[PDB]
Structures are given as C-alpha cells and as structure tokens.
Write a protein that binds this ligand. Sequence first.
Ligand SMILES: COc1ccc2nc(C)c(O[C@@H]3C[C@H]4C(=O)N[C@]5(C(=O)NS(=O)(=O)C6(C)CC6)C[C@H]5/C=C\CCCCC[C@H](NC(=O)OC(C)(C)C)C(=O)N4C3)nc2c1
Ligand SMILES: [Zn+2]
Length: 198
Amino acid sequence: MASMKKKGSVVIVGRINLSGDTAYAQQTRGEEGCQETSQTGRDKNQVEGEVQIVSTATQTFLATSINGVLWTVYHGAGTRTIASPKGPVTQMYTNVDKDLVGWQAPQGSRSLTPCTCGSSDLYLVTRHADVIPVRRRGDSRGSLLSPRPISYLKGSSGGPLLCPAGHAVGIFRAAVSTRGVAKAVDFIPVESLETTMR
Ligand SMILES: COc1ccc2nc(C)c(O[C@@H]3C[C@H]4C(=O)N[C@]5(C(=O)NS(=O)(=O)C6(C)CC6)C[C@H]5/C=C\CCCCC[C@H](NC(=O)OC(C)(C)C)C(=O)N4C3)nc2c1
Ligand SMILES: [Zn+2]
C-alpha cells in the first residue's frame, strides 16, 4: 500500500495554431518539463488556441476546446487529471462508452462553437496541422477525400472535425482502415458532447 504509485496528469505540450492563414504545430513544453509537470500537476505555461497537443508519460494526442470544455478521448487520457497553474484538475466529464472525457477549458484557451450548419463537407485537423477534407457519411463517420496511411493520423485522436465555417462538428476518435490505409474516420458528434454536458 505504502508504495502504490499515482498516475500523472495529462500535460499540454503544444498546440495547433489556427489563428492565421497557415496551420502549424507549436511545441510549448519539452519532454523533460512534461514529465515534471505530469508528476506535480502544476503547469504555469500560458495556454492559447482551440486545439492543444497533450501528453502523458506514455501517449500523445490532441484535445479540443468546445463550449468552455477541453475535450479528448478516454483511450488517451483515461480518468487522469490535467495539469494547471494551481495543480491537478479533475475531469468534469467521463464517458467510456463514447471514448470521451472533458475538463474545464484552461484559462487563455479559445473555444470552438458547436456547428449547426448541417453541412457534410468537413475538415479534420491533425497533430501535424494537416487539414484533411472529409465527407460526412453518417452520424459518426466521414470518408477521407484523399486516403492516407494510418501513420499520418496516429496521435490525432481528440482533434476536431470542422465545418466550412470553422465550427466544431465532432472529435476524432478512431480510424477506419483496410491494409493500413485510412479511408474513413470515426468521430464523436458535437451533439453527443452537448448531451454529455446535460
Ligand atoms: C480504454 O477505454 C476505451 C473506451 C472506448 C474506446 N473506443 C474506441 C473506438 C477505441 O479505439 C482504439 C483506439 C482508437 C485509435 O487509435 N484512435 C486514433 C489515435 O490517433 N489514437 S492516439 O492518439 O494515437 C492514442 C492511442 C491515444 C494515444 C485516431 C487513430 C489514428 C490512427 C489509427 C491507428 C490504428 C488503430 C485503428 C483503430 N480503429 C478502430 O477501432 O475502428 C473502429 C471502426 C472503431 C473499429 C482506432 O482508431 N482506435 C483503437 N478505443 C477505446 C478505449
Ligand atoms: Zn458550421
């Protein structure tokens, strides 16, 4: 009992910059400071933007602010706290059945607006700041206009699917692949986030 360890916090280690004409990834914390911040849960770095790059000791993925909540996937974050300036912050939403978790959005983040356009021409933002056109094919599925090996999507769970107007349509959850090629994506619809919020 006395030797039982505690899992560290999720740590924001960068962001996908979508503020201008060019999307690009930025790193805000190196691996060493990440490990220390994960243990203490104390992250004094200023947060900016809608899409964060997050890490644990063993995984890296994305997290997306929508409606004042920073959302990501349960298969990345588990039940972990997230680091913040004043210490670990406990999840506000947890739903393993949807592969979904959420924390209060960090001070300084900006939130995406939930999409009400009803459009099926979507855009997936990856951890490498690729903007991938995706045609919506169902409530939780969309096809890549240009399929790519799954290597190019690995690490992007928790990222957004956006409509042409830049609203949040869903959270990237899983890749649909045949012989290692991602032809489609599975995502958590924003309406499912809004229901979780109730
Ligand atoms: C632990 O409790 C739970 C609860 C609910 C749950 N629901 C789930 C649906 C679920 O799927 C598992 C995790 C998820 C996943 O890899 N996503 C990411 C990702 O980037 N991840 S990540 O950032 O690298 C990471 C690993 C966090 C750091 C987006 C894709 C990028 C490349 C695909 C790699 C090849 C795996 C292809 C799987 N295709 C797949 O299952 O397709 C369907 C059509 C769904 C069968 C897949 O995509 N997979 C399996 N796991 C869970 C686990
Ligand atoms: Zn929209």
